[PDB]
Amino acid sequence: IVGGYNCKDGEVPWQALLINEENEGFCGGTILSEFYILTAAHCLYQAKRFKVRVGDRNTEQEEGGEAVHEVEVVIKHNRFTKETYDFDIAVLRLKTPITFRMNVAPASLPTAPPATGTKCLISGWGNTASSGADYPDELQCLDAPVLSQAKCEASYPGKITSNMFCVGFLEGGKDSCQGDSGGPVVCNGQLQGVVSWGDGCAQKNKPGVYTKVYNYVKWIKNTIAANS
Amino acid sequence: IVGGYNCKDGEVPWQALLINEENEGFCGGTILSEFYILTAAHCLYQAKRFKVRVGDRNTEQEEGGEAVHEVEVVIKHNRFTKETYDFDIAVLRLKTPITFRMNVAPASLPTAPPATGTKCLISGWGNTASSGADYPDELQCLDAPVLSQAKCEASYPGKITSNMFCVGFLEGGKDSCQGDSGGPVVCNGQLQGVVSWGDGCAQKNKPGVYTKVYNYVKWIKNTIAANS
Ligand SMILES: *C[C@@](*)(O)[C@H](CCCNC(N)=[NH2+])NC(=O)[C@@H]1CCCN1C(=O)[C@H](N)Cc1ccccc1
Numbered sequence: 001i002v003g004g005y006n007c008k009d010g011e012v013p014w015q016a017l018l019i020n021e022e023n024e025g026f027c028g029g030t031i032l033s034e035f036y037i038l039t040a041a042h043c044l045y046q047a048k049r050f051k052v053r054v055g056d057r058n059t060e061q062e063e064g065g066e067a068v069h070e071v072e073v074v075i076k077h078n079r080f081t082k083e084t085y086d087f088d089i090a091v092l093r094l095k096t097p098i099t100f101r102m103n104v105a106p107a108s109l110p111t112a113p114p115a116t117g118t119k120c121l122i123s124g125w126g127n128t129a130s131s132g133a134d135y136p137d138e139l140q141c142l143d144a145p146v147l148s149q150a151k152c153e154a155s156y157p158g159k160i161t162s163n164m165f166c167v168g169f170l171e172g173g174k175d176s177c178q179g180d181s182g183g184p185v186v187c188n189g190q191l192q193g194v195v196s197w198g199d200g201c202a203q204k205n206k207p208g209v210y211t212k213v214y215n216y217v218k219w220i221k222n223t224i225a226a227n228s
Numbered sequence: 229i230v231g232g233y234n235c236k237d238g239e240v241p242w243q244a245l246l247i248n249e250e251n252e253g254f255c256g257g258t259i260l261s262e263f264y265i266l267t268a269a270h271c272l273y274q275a276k277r278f279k280v281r282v283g284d285r286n287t288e289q290e291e292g293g294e295a296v297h298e299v300e301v302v303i304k305h306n307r308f309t310k311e312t313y314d315f316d317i318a319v320l321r322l323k324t325p326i327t328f329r330m331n332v333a334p335a336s337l338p339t340a341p342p343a344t345g346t347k348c349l350i351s352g353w354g355n356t357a358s359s360g361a362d363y364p365d366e367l368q369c370l371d372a373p374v375l376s377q378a379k380c381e382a383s384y385p386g387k388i389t390s391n392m393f394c395v396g397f398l399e400g401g402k403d404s405c406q407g408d409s410g411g412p413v414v415c416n417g418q419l420q421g422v423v424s425w426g427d428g429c430a431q432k433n434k435p436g437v438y439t440k441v442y443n444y445v446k447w448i449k450n451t452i453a454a455n456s
């Protein structure tokens with residue numbers, strides 16, 4: 001996240017982090033239920049083996065800590081292709097269920113498409129620098145408005161599908177970035193997006209492009225039920 | 229199919245054949261609907277590119293011929309592993325829907341588990357020789373009884389899961405074989421199995437092992453709905 005702030009305690013209970021073999025974070029995730037995590041399909045090929053980490057170390061407000069989970073089944077949307085980065089969505093099934101608490105809870109699937117102007121909360125452990133590499137020690141948060149499809153399409157001519165939507169600032173300075181992929185975009189209490197891609201990070205007229213979760217509610221629900 | 233007979237005209241309307249780059253058949257399939265085909269997950273790695281062929285050339289009884297379809301989406305059961313060959317099931321989505329007729333129709337999913345002793349019809353274009361390679365010019369058919377789980381487990385100690393069942397003859401001589409994988413096992417009008425694996429072909433005390441479709445009704449239905 002570029003130009004964000006240190007998330008306040010208990011602000012993103014549904015946040016998950018994918019960690020590689022070297023115990024390093026490379027992508028985000030969203031808790032959907034005790035066994036399921038939502039992330040980006042493109043994160044699946046950015047590492048051979050990985051686990052999922054949820055929770056936090058702020059025991060002052062609530063005890064429990066961070067919990068690392070092993071992934072039992074990886075279910076990538078079969079229509080994903082890096083040619084367009086369309087269908088950049090995947091569902092993970094953990095070996096052991098997550099023990100929920102007030103600061104570790106699932107996100108709500110959307111019941112209506114995202115509305116232009118609506119404020120959303122984007123979070124992640126990804127790069128905080130427009131140019132260069134500066135990763136945070138604390139989870140980052142960013143409040144950004146949903147952009148009209150017209151401005152989105154105008155930003156990425158012919159590269160925006162119906163399964164994508166833009167969130168951010170046309171003037172640049174604040175956006176998600178590398179490592180944030182898979183992370184949540186929560187607008188008014190609903191999970192409206194998954195961090196996906198963009199031209200650079202926080203560039204002028206180059207807002208972050210997100211997977212429109214509303215278009216995948218049926219795929220997520222049935223995929224989980226097919227494997228449950 | 230070893231020790232079978234030339235299927236009679238219109239006997240297996242739901243039969244599908246997977247063909248590789250060289251236009252050669254390497255696996256079977258079952259028509260489930262106009263856009264979906266059921267086959268074995270292990271067939272997916274036996275060829276890079278492939279298409280699906282349905283229909284027949286017996287225009288005497290009905291016109292239409294054979295139709296070759298391109299595969300749009302391949303949906304393999306994510307729990308499949310060649311370590312056990314458990315979850316040997318996959319669903320294919322065609323680019324163009326199949327034009328049904330009396331001799332080209334979908335199979336019925338099961339509503340009850342397979343019963344011991346029940347007669348089933350197994351079909352395929354696979355090898356017809358116990359030892360050696362002798363492929364048929366015509367679709368082969370085989371009528372075989374469902375074996376008790378006890379005899380099945382006794383045939384393959386510790387290798388039979390709850391998602392598998394045996395069909396065939398303990399004395400050998402008649403069984404499915406290489407190339408038949410993915411093909412249908414229809415008992416009393418219901419699709420009860422998918423050709424999967426076995427120790428050799430038509431060997432004594434080594435009956436064919438099939439994917440128990442009844443255990444996957446939920447996975448098939450929801451997977452199709454998740455992608456439809
Ligand atoms: C995997 C995710 O961490 C990451 C998120 C980037 C978010 N960026 C902004 N500005 N909000 N996604 C990616 O790295 C994706 C997947 C791989 C390629 N990709 C991109 O974002 C490319 N930079 C997009 C691209 C633009 C022009 C030409 C080729 C690719």
Ligand SMILES: *C[C@@](*)(O)[C@H](CCCNC(N)=[NH2+])NC(=O)[C@@H]1CCCN1C(=O)[C@H](N)Cc1ccccc1
Pocket residue numbers: 254255268270271313354403404405406407408409410423424425426427428429430434435436437
């Ligand atoms: C892919 C299918 O055409 C084919 C069907 C064989 C059916 N045989 C009988 N007797 N009904 N399946 C296979 O070839 C599968 C998948 C790959 C391995 N395999 C086997 O059947 C092996 N021969 C099973 C095996 C036995 C002992 C040790 C290792 C493997």
